[PDB]
């Protein structure tokens, strides 16, 4: 019964998915032009890059 | 605290180039204002003395 250790499997999976989501949120834009800061700093003017 | 009175003569089509959020020849190689400039820009035509 692999579900016997479910109380610990859920904890480790929650930690892993929290880390993977926190690191994946760096690829989002949140309404910006690009997810990479170096692309924004090399394609737009300072008053809009800021 | 401090009031700086910068004075210079430019061309009519180059008056708009002096701005915190603009880029141009006069803005890059003659007179550059910071992105957080606090003050007023005063300009007037003076084609009588020059």
From Swiss-Prot, chain A:
Superkingdom field: Viruses
Species, as recorded: Severe acute respiratory syndrome coronavirus 2
Coiled coil ranges: 9-50
Protein task: Subunit of the fusion protein that is processed upon entry into the host cell. Mediates fusion of the virion and cellular membranes by functioning as a class I viral fusion protein. Contains a viral fusion peptide that is unmasked after S2 cleavage. This cleavage can occur at the cell membrane by host TMPRSS2 or during endocytosis by host CSTL. In either case, this triggers an extensive and irreversible conformational change that leads to fusion of the viral envelope with the cellular cytoplasmic membrane, releasing viral genomic RNA into the host cell cytoplasm.
Name of the protein in its database record: Spike protein S2'
